[PDB]
């Protein structure tokens, strides 16, 4: 009460924030060791935690005197600091043992910090706003995962516990990879024996041995995420025949068509969120603050112009002298010429900075330092003349300029101290590059690129927040895993880099996670830390929270910003067009207003130079709907020789067996023995070969006779050549291999045949166009981090073959190896890394590999050991340099992927209609008009009889207690086919075998019983009752397969346990939302084929210039090309392929075949394998996940509408609703039906469309009554087409209630806008 | 680092060349 009004005054909230962030930072401070050993440090810590606990009880306590209790308690923020605050008196007063859970609480306290910032509470309010709706598509996804792992319960379970052994001795398997027992699996090789029991591949955690296990595998499969290891488990185990089957959808259900639903919801969401009242507002004080600015530039010209007239006039005829000097020198700063001059030194700049490389001459070294005084210099008088000219304030006015004096003070900074210390380098003489940015104001594109950067400029506060709130919870989960575990990573060898001892590597290692590489690494040593497979599991809780709720909560972060600013920009671009030729027009409209004493000109002049800007009206659906949303917002506020070649290339019948060849050349390409050059299978197809590139020659003379073209002669001539060559010695092999990889261009003769798939090449194309510039700036970006990282670590990543010897001259000789518990002699020879930054070229490499997140803490390692210029590593001598890589995946693979994402998705052109001119007043109104228009009036098919049997069979299996009960069948059925696990009893398995009888008994009763219930045809006219007899009887064969005698040895018949497992599905009818989102994700994926038609080329072509280049690499183990991922045949390069675009070890793949591989012993070459690969590798990474991008976004926008509803006048969906209502009443078509029953009608449906409460309901009495109606004809006549109509005319674009004359205008513009129906509405309309 | 074919930890990164798959780099 008193204590209250003179407490709170803001230095106690700033006195306890500070308590809040020291007791942070001593939570940062502890370390942790194992086998209960304790530093000194630690001691000295723990007594300060009764002074945080009595300042926090105080706080809480003072608190409490002033807002009551169960009000200061309700809040949210209050029960989580009275909690923590209890947790910590308990903690200090409780001496027993049970402590560790409460002890934990602890790890909360940072989030206090929250409590006391109101603006991070809004923030985090703002983001967790949008993960609402995202609930519903995680239980999708759960209805997923579970239905995966029932099958890899059905298929998989106890099949990893059988090893090669050697005869045995002690149980040591030789090797870490499951076999089969002579069997298409991987036989044990020597004198091994494939014996019962071991563990499993991952200390036994992979498998599929119970529901859990399986649950936790299938989710670890479908992050994309050591999904190929589990595969190739299989393979091995069973035979790699039908398992690509099970993994394949499982990756392209669960990842890609999750990360599209993801993505489709998040984008409507903010769509939605961004035409609110309260963001609008802001928006368009943004835009006027941003136009009042462009207007006082010109006014200050026109100043400065008139100023400088009259001084000169005045000293026509001291201060005078300098003020012209002053003049002069803010005159030579805004010509063309200077632009022009700084330009090319800044390029001349960047051109000196990129030569950097490692082992570069003396000379080239003086030369550099020496150039970078004088550019050095060069900037400084430029910036100084700039200042003087312009002025101190008007130079600091522009934030470009604000750029260069911070890029100037830090270079200067760098040059004196490397001056005083030589030595490392900051690196930001190189930011000077950026500046180069300036090239594009000479373009068109200025205005969209510098409206970006003032939409992210008026955004700092909110992206801070949102950057230091996601610092916060990635400190939290630190501290959390600091406290499981916190020092137990030592039971192996060496405790790894990945831990949790102290605080920076505990923070690293969450932030490694949350970039989702090797995170099921970690998941399995932290198990094994808390021991074992059997009491250790629990603690994969927590890194399963950390993958989910990071990432999506990153998307959540780094999307929405883009989506936001990126938006933003687009409109003040085209508003600044909008705000400028609306202005235009009326100067001609008054440049002929004020003369009238002459025939005006400039009035024509305008006519026939407005047209000329009007014909780029591209308008993306994204602006359209955001325009209609802006309209719905509005509205709800105010309402409160020559021939005969001609001939034979017109013939209709022509292109067709072109294609067909075309076709036949493509699988003939495709059936190829890389490595077993000397087959008849070869000859045959050189044979094929001749004769198909001897047509293509007959078609390609006669078509020239009378762009893709040249593609065409190419792929012609090409052919030619190595033909030519044919017929002698090997002359030339590089050019006979070249010539026969350049025959991979055969499919591409399609795109142009077909003009769908022309046309989506033409998307595509288009898509790519709209983006070129943000790539430009993205490229910028990454070589300016590229040559950063060059100074920092080049010449820095060699090392000897021995750890001991850190210089080169000592690196030389033998010494003595310890592996396999036998010392050997190897030779001691000086190597260097993988990927390394030696110069510009390497740089930008290996940071795309690191940007596509594969093998980044192995280079993150690297770069730590590094030590100087010619040494060998020491580990962890530069922790702090991972700074910059935390810093790389802030910027490239966080936000420049996601502003990428967000530019397709707001700039996407609509294909469908290519045109805005169909009706120009209908958007979703003919989508929800044109349900009802399609769907007769479908019934239920009542009985007609109704004597004694028949209808008591009808009403029984209708009766909602009997769906009740087979509802409650499925849940049964489907806890059992979960319940089986692995080395179960006897009588168990027994048990679960009758429950499965009894429950496939029963389906079978309920599937006979309806076909007497309704008939037999009247039974299979819906499509979901024939999948249900066509499941019971699949369960049915099963069952008498597995009952009765099996197939001894014939042909495999264990899929139909599959039957069974399909009753899932059967669940899935009552998720009313999810039912509907999944049906318009399909059914859009199937509007879209060519798209799909493309990936698919996309993937054949690369497959088979992979079959042709690396398809004869020796198939070694220990490398990236081996038994299980090789380019040796078509299906194995497609799953190469595949394994790439996931992402699983992309970058070794490519480093296994480089220009230097030991070559196949069939294979008639002794070098195989070339430097393509960089090219080869880069470009699909490129091109596959920008085709993928393309398809996402083709898919979201064709849904648009729905995921954009704002449901309150939802019209497309509740006719579906309205149909289920209304099929109660009519038996069937009748023509026309009574008039009593539309009365209840209006009430059965739901009330939202028609009647919300009982006043509204006058309005539904004003809808039947008050204008004309059907009863002209007969009484009893039907209204639903008259009454839904009426509904879905009347709930928006309403204008016939204010005149209720003009009725024949409105009913002739909707006849003519459905000209053409067939003439089946004009009963409908009446 | 350790060699090729050493048995190894896919958590410690210390394979000179190539990953640590299934124990071996
Ligand atoms: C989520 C975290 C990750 C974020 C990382 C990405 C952050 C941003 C990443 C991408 C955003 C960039 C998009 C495209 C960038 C440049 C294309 C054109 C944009 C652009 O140039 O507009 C600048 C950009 O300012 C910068 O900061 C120059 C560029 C520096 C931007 C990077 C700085 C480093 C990061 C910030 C560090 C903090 C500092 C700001 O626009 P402005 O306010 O200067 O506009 C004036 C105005 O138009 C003047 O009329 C014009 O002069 P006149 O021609 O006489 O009219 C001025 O030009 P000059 O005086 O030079 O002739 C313009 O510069
Ligand atoms: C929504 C987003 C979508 C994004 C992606 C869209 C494009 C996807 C493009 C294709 C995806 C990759 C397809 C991977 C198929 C790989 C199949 C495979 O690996 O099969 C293995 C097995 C044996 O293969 P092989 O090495 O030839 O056997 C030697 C002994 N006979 O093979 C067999 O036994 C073959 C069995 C029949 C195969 C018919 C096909
Ligand atoms: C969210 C929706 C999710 C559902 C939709 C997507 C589901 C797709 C995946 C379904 C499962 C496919 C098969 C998975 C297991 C592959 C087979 C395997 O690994 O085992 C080989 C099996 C027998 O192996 P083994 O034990 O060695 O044989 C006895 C030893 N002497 O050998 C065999 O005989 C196995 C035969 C495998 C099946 C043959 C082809 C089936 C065609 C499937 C079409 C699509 C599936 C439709 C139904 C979906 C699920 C209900
Ligand atoms: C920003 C614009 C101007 C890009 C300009 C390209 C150069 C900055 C790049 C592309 C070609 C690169 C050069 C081409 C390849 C190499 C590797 C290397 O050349 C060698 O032959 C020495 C290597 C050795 O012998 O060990 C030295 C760097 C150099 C020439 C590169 C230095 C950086 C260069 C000059
Ligand atoms: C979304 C963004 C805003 C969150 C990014 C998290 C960073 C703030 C974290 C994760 C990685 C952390 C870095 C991980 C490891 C280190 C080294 C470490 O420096 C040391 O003191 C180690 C020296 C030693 O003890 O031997 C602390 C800084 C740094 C780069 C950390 C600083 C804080 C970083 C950059
Ligand atoms: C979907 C279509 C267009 C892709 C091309 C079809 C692929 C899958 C077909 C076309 C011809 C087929 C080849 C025909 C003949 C043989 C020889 C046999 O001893 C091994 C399999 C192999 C090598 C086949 C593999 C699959 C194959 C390459
Ligand atoms: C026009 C395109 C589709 C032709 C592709 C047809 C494929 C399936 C045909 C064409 C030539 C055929 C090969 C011709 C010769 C031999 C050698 C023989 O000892 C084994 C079969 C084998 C290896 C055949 C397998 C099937 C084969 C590869
Ligand atoms: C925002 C982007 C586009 C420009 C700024 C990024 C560059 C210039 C900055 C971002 C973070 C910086 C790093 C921060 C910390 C360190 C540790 C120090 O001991 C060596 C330099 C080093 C490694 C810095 C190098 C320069 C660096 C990478
Ligand atoms: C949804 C829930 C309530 C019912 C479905 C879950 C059932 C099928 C799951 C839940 C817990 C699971 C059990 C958890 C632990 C074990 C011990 C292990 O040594 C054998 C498997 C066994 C016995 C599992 C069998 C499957 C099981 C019983
Ligand atoms: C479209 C363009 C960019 C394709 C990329 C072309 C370059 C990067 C490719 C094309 C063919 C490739 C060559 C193919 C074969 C060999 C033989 C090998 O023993 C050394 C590398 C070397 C010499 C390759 C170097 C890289 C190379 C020249
Ligand atoms: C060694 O292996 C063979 C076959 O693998 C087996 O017959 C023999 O019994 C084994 N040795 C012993 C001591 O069991
Ligand atoms: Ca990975």
Known sequence: ???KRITEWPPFEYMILATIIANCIVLALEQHLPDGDKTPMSERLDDTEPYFIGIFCFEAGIKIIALGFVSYL???????????????????AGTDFDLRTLRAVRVLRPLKLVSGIPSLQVVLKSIMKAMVPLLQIGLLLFFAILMFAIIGLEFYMGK???????????????????????????????????????????????????????????????????????????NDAAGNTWNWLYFIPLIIIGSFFMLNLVLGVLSGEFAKERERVENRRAFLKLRRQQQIERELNGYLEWIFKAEEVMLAEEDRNFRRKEKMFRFFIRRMVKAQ???????????????????????????????????????????????????????????????????????????????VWAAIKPGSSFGISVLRALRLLRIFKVTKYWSSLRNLVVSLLNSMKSIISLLFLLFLFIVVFALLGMQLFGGQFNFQDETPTTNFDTFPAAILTVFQILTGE????????????????????????????????????????????????????????????????????????????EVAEVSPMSAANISIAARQQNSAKARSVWEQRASQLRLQNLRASCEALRRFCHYIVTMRYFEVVILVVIALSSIALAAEDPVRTDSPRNNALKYLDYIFTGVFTFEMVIKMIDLWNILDFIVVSGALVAFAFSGSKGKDINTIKSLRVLRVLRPLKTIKRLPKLKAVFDCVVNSLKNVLNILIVYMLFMFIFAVIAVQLFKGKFFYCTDESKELERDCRGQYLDYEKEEVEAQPRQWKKYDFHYDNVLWALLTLFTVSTGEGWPMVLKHSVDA????????????????????????????????????????????????????????????????????????????????????????????????????????????????????????????????????????????????????????????????????????????????????????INLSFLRLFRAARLIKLLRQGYTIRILLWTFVQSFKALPYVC???????????????QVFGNIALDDDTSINRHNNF?????????????????????????????????????????????????????????????????????????????????????????????????????????????????????????????????????????????????????????????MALIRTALEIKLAPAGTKQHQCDAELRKEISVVWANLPQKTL | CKGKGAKCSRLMYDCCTGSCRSGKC
């Not at chain 1, 499951?178 to 044990?188: D, I, N, S």
């Not at chain 1, 998941?523 to 009491?535: A, D, F, L, R």
């Not at chain 1, 038609?1093 to 079959?1107: D, K, P, Q, S, V």
């Not at chain 1, 993928?1188 to 309150?1208: G, H, K, Q």
Request: contains cysteine.
């Open chain 1, 1 to 3: 009460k008193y204590a």
């Open chain 1, 74 to 92: 309700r809040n949210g923020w209050n029960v989580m600091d009275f909690v923590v605050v209890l947790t910590g008196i308990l903690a200090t």
């Open chain 1, 160 to 234: 990893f516990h059988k090893a090669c052994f050697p005869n045995s001795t002690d149980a040591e398997p030789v090797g870490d990879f499951p076999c089969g027992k002579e069997a298409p699996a991987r036989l044990c090789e020597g004198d091994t024996e494939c014996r019962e029991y071991w563990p499993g591949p991952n200390f036994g955690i992979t498998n599929f041995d119970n529901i859990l296990f399986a649950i936790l595998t299938v989710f670890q499969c479908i992050t994309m995420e050591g999904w190929t290891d589990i595969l190739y488990n299989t």
């Open chain 1, 337 to 415: 010429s200077f632009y022009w001059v700084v330009l090319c030194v800044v390029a001349l700049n960047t051109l000196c900075v990129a030569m950097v490389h490692y082992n570069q001459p003396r000379r080239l070294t003086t030369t550099l330092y020496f150039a970078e005084f004088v550019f050095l210099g060069l900037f400084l008088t430029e910036m100084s003349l700039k200042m003087y000219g312009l002025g101190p304030r008007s130079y600091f006015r522009s934030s470009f300029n604000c750029f260069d004096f911070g890029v100037i003070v830090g270079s200067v900074f760098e040059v």
């Open chain 1, 518 to 593: 090797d995170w099921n690494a970690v998941m399995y040593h932290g198990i094994e830390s808390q021991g074992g497979v059997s009491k250790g599991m629990f603690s994969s809780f927590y890194f399963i929270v950390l993958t989910l709720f990071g990432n999506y909560t990153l998307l959540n972060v780094f999307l929405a910003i883009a989506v936001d600013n990126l938006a933003n920009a687009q409109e003040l671009t085209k508003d600044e067009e909008e705000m400028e030729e609306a202005a235009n027009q009326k100067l001609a409209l008054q440049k002929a207003k």
């Open chain 1, 867 to 1050: 030590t100087y210029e010619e040494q060998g590593p020491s580990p962890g001598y530069r922790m702090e340099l991972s700074i910059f890589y935390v810093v790389y995946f802030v910027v490239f693979p966080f936000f420049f992927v996601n502003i990428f994402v967000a530019l397709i998705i707001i700039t996407f052109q609509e294909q469908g209609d290519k045109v805005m001119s169909e009706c120009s007043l209908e958007k979703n109104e003919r989508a929800c008009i044109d349900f009802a228009i399609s769907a007769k009036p479908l019934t239920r098919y009542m009985p007609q009889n109704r004597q004694s049997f028949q209808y008591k069979t009808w009403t029984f299996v209708v009766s909602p207690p009997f769906e009740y009960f087979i509802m409650a069948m499925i849940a049964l059925n489907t806890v059992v086919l979960m319940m089986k696990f692995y080395d179960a009893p006897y009588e168990y398995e027994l048990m679960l075998k009758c429950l499965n009888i009894v429950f496939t008994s029963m389906f079978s009763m309920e599937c006979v019983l309806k076909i007497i219930a309704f008939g037999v045809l009247n039974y299979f006219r819906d499509a979901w009752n024939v999948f249900d007899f066509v499941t019971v009887l699949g369960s049915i064969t099963d069952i008498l397969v597995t009952e009765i005698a099996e197939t001894n040895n014939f």
């Open chain 1, 1093 to 1107: 038609l493309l990936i698919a080329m996309l993937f054949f072509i690369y497959a088979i210039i992979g079959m």
């Open chain 1, 1128 to 1284: 040796r045949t078509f299906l194995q390069a497609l799953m190469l392929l595949f394994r790439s675009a996931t992402g699983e070890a992309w970058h070794e793949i490519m480093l296994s075949c480089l220009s230097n591989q030991a070559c196949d012993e069939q294979a008639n070459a002794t070098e195989c394998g070339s430097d393509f690969a960089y090219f080869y590798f880069v470009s699909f990474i490129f091109l596959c996940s920008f085709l993928m991008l393309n398809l996402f976004v083709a898919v979201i926008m064709d849904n648009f509408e729905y995921l954009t509803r704002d449901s309150s006048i939802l019209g497309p969906h509740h006719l579906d609703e309205f149909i289920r209502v209304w099929a109660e009443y009519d038996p069937a078509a009748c023509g026309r039906i009574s008039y009593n029953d539309m009365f209840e009608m209006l009430k059965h449906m739901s009330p939202p469309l028609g009647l919300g409460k009982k006043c509204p309901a006058r309005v539904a009495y004003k809808r039947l009554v008050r204008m004309n109606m059907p009863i002209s004809n007969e009484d009893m006549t039907v209204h639903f087409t008259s009454t839904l």
